[PDB]
Amino acid sequence: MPMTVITLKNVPQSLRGDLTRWMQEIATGVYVGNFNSRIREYLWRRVQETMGAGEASMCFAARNELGYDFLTENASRSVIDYDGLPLIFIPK
Amino acid sequence: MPMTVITLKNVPQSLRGDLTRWMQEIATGVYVGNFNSRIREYLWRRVQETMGAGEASMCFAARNELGYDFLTENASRSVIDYDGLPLIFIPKE
Amino acid sequence: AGPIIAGKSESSELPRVEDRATFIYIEHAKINRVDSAVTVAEAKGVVRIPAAMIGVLLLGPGTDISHRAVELLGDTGTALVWVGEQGVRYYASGRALARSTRFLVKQAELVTNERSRLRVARRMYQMRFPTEDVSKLTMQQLRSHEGARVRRKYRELSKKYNVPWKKRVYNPDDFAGGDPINQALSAAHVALYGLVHSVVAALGLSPGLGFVHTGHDRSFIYDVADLYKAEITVPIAFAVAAEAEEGQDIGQLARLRTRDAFVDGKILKRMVKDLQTLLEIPEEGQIEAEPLSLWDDKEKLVPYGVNYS
Amino acid sequence: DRATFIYIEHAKINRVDSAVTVAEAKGVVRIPAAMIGVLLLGPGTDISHRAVELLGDTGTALVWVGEQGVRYYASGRALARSTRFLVKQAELVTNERSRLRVARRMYQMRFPTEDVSKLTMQQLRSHEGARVRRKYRELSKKYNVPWKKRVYNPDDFAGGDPINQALSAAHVALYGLVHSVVAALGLSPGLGFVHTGHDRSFIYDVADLYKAEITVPIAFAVAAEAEEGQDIGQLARLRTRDAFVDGKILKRMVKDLQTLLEIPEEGQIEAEPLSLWDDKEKLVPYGVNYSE
Amino acid sequence: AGPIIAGKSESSELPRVEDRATFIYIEHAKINRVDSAVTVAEAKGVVRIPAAMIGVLLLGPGTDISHRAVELLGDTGTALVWVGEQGVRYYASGRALARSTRFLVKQAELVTNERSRLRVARRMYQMRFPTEDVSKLTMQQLRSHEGARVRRKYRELSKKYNVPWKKRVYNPDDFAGGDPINQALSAAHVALYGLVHSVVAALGLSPGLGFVHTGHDRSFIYDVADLYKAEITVPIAFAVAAEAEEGQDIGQLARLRTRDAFVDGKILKRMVKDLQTLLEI
Amino acid sequence: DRATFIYIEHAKINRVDSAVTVAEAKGVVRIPAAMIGVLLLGPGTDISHRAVELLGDTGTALVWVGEQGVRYYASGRALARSTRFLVKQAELVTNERSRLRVARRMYQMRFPTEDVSKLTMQQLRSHEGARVRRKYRELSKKYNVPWKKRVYNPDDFAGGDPINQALSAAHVALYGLVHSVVAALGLSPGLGFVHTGHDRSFIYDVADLYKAEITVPIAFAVAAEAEEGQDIGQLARLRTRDAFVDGKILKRMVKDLQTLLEIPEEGQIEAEPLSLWDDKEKLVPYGVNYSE
DNA sequence: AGATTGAGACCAGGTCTCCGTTTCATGAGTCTTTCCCGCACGAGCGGGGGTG
DNA sequence: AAACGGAGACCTGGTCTCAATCTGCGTGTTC
DNA sequence: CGCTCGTGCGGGAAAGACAGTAATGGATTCCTTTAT
DNA sequence: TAAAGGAATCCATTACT
């Protein structure tokens, strides 16, 4: 099973604890977990519905030559595609 | 290649920018990359020798039931093995 | 689907029965629910447990659990086993992970029929001892022979690892001891019983509808655990008892080696497959449109939720 | 052969020497371990390892439930670790003749004014649907609540009529109690006679016995007594938990479960829905201490 | 080992030449080293490039790159190619990623010997077209056959995808990039040239010591690139030109398709192994 | 036969029509690119895409260096994108006859008096080592600085004698400028004659020519006057920087590289450095416009 | 009694601006030969349909 | 002209704590 | 026909050569006090 | 005169580099 990382900032406490129920909290708001595509999509839906007015960002093992891809919900750091390569873009 | 995640908190800006040559920064202080074991070990050694008085934690794919293991260097949250299984332990102030 | 709520999860949102971690031992700590999270508070800090990634949870001596913690653990399919001293003390589980009862119906059909029960016990004995032939002996002969071979394996491994065995055998019902060998066997078997209980509960099978063991609610748990106690837990506990030095936690090393054995032998996928093949369930990848249906004599299943005016 | 369905909530259970203790805000209770048959652990309950070990040693069945059993959350083992109820249920559900017998028995106890022993499954279910419609109309006209047709979405609870929401909440609060009783007695919720193919099939089969007598009147009473914008599901659950406080429904459920499985009257255990501080004078002669 | 300085890294601390990404195109931006990180700044914001995981870092029009930025890019073995309009305009590289010059001295030995040069030219032509036999063809004959075959492939792919084509064989030195087919070919070809340059500079080989192409500093780059050009880039560019829409960025689509081709064909590992067997190691 | 070596630092190069526009704080310079041979982009320099376009069009050899070439960071193409020097170096290093001839020429220009026609390659190495010891002792007695053996720890620069640190820093600065000149000219640093098997073998093979006469005296001087508590690497780097500011060392290196490869004197190109704000008087006739 | 939520509080760390100090972290007077580690290679089982 | 480190400035977001309110997550004879 | 563990080939690093000097003991030579 | 002895002279051997 691939690897998934979810970073949550300014989200309800319930979402943080619920993710700790699925994936462990390495850092404040930073979770890592091992599971397949189906569970990953279900967890992303959970985060999307129960994040409220906060930002979420999930980095998951994928099929690009970097080896990972990004899905961000209302996140400060956008994801910009340089010709097939996801790069984290920080607006000024 | 196994996925490696490094979280840095309160470290000099030199290391914070230096890791971005290997791992992208999804959020402040969080870096994600895909390396082999040797590159990841050298990255952890570099983080150890550069972070100074700071907090660093790495999570990487392993061969236990969960599938990942942690190396924490001067981090608030320790790692306790519950009979061979890594669980992150949070000391209470 | 419906709205997503913290603390409640669908069966699909959780890993399959065989894809989870095996077990966790917790002692001298309090399990509670905070922020919709199962947290074990020790004397020094808190540990958030990925309950969705853990098949069963073991509770040692001096351990407290809260009502909300129990229902939260039951949400994710994690089973509670109070593994105190002298073996497993109590079990607990929530609703079954599997909404369908295609396994439980077949288990009931086999356990009720005497011929099918004999066939299933024979298949169990074949899986434990594949060399022999079991086409002739009866139930009492099966019990006597399995007990004889169990104590034969105990004596063999005790001689091999040079540990003193007082002509005993491990049975979770009233097994007490203080020797390192007894503690190692108890620690190695409580994990197996907890894992078996979790796998049976998560599959919808009845823990009470046993074939070889009868007379209690955890007979089928014992029967399914017997298929692997001889192969896995006994040699591992013997090796732990032999290897351990003075002033070493025999339980901790026993559980470490037990988890190593579970990962190496692929006991979880093997256990799911064994449970599927004992009940003669053909492989069927198609998923039924609706689990619940009303029962009819001539039309067999008839759809539910409709008013017959 | 009596089972004490002791209900604990807002408490922290531990063990003193050989008897569990209760640490409710009212005081301290020292129930002997052998006294408890089934311990219904309600919300705000902290059960300890020593208490669980002692209760398991005596065959006590621990069921983590909601307030007065409205929701079933988790269950331990059977009462006294017995399995005769489960084996009897399996025997009666496996073969068709016994399945017809028990389905007819359930329909007959659901039809007190008629004898339905000759009807087949199609006629039985048609009669059940007609009775459901008649009861819906009767309780609609009694409470002056409009009623057109039972419509709901399992994936959308909010987007429903208040009547349907109240009925769903009350029926689920009944399913919780039925599942709690089934798990405490040791039966298997999956092996149902009329309903089949689900984890909770036998629970629905048993709950249909009390649907028209408890949950439907409660749902219609809540729907009638409700202002616009009020959370009607909470009201229905609270009214249903108020219905379960007395414990008569619990004893009725135990007796009905015995009757369905053709248990001989000598083998019929009787539930004793005890309350801690409501029955102090009843429990002091039995060895229970009530400290404050 | 010794102390680690932020912005300085050993070669063992880096991914191999095979394990890194292909390239990144940057245009109308400013490469700049801030906090010891190569950051491309645009109007909206900034993006920090993972230099250690990228082979070549192409630079588009309107691109200003600092001094310490080039120092840091050369540290991680990332080569720079100033990819402007109508072809590659300039190259740049750090020192090297390999501390052993065995491959370089072997290449020099093979290029200074006329018989060895002819042998390597025959091997490269056979590697381009394995169905033919050229054991008796001279150098001029080999060059003429290469030209004929590449023009034939161009025309064949022109008819295959049903697109106008002027038979203009791509020469990066002052190319004619007016047409959408020309733009797509240039967009793929500059990426291939940048990748070849990055690999050659990382393996220690001399870009000037060429076998078929000679007379300038990037001859061996052109040889190695021409080895895979007709087989990778040309079909991709012709598909992009054929599969196109009005108002669609032809360059971005071409670069996406050529990166997909590079990943699918494993042209990076293939390039390294081809250099291995082409130099007798 | 003319090659301009312009060192641009603390500046920002752009392009207007056909001439690069250096934007130093002193003023704006408008050097035509047709006469630029080598552009040493020193620290604090910002090059633009139009500038690189124009320079690569004219065959300019951009080299990203340190202070006056103390460190070599990156390089582009060569003069006029020519590879004749590289071809000659390869043809001279592949065969042992020419390689030995070039090594002998190296030794004889390092030591004009000693005969080389009888010394083999390892004989050359041994003689070079002996003369290096002699030079070290002579400069040690001339500058007081005592001289225990050269103890260069590659991984730990802090641990060592101040004179050892001075030698290391001066030598790496010399390697940097030698590499800058070699990369600008177009030769490969790998193809070394005396030194072999490393990336910069030719760089050491050209730096040993000037080590004893430039960097060793500099290192001994800086160690002699080194006060306690001062880092020696920076001082040695700065002194070598100044020696390179003088500008004749680059001319000598280009001349010696042309001598090693027996390049005919008719076809040899002569390199001269150009400082913008120090040599503007010669630049004005060339069309180099200035603005203050 | 246990858990959640809102409010209100505090505060550690992040980010920015400003300022002065740098252009930097510094091997190979010599190398080949013999050692190694590599992270590739490796092969079988698969699981087929076929076998029964 | 760049890039850094140090020293301030400041801010937001995480976390602890105090009342206050509830005990909770709702199909199964509806189509 | 896609998965693992045991078999190794490109990197290493380490000694180990290759050349001659510096210092000290031995052979030689000179003095220098020993004894005369 | 010459043994004689050590210091100094010159030389040889090896470790330094």
Residue numbers in the entry:
A (entry chain A): 1 to 92
B (entry chain D): 1 to 93
C (entry chain C): 2 to 310
D (entry chain B), F (entry chain E): 20 to 311
E (entry chain F): 2 to 282
What does the paper say about this structure?
The natural Cas1–Cas2/exonuclease fusion (trimmer-integrase) catalyses coordinated DNA capture, trimming and integration.
The 3.1 Å half-site structure reveals interactions at the first integration strand junction. The spacer-ligated first CRISPR repeat guanine G29 was found in two approximately equivalent conformations. In the first conformation, G29 forms a canonical base pair with C35 (Fig. 3d (middle)). In the second conformation, G29 flips upwards, making a specific contact with loop 7 lysine Lys168. The lysine also contacts the 3′ hydroxyl of the leader (Fig. 3d (left)).
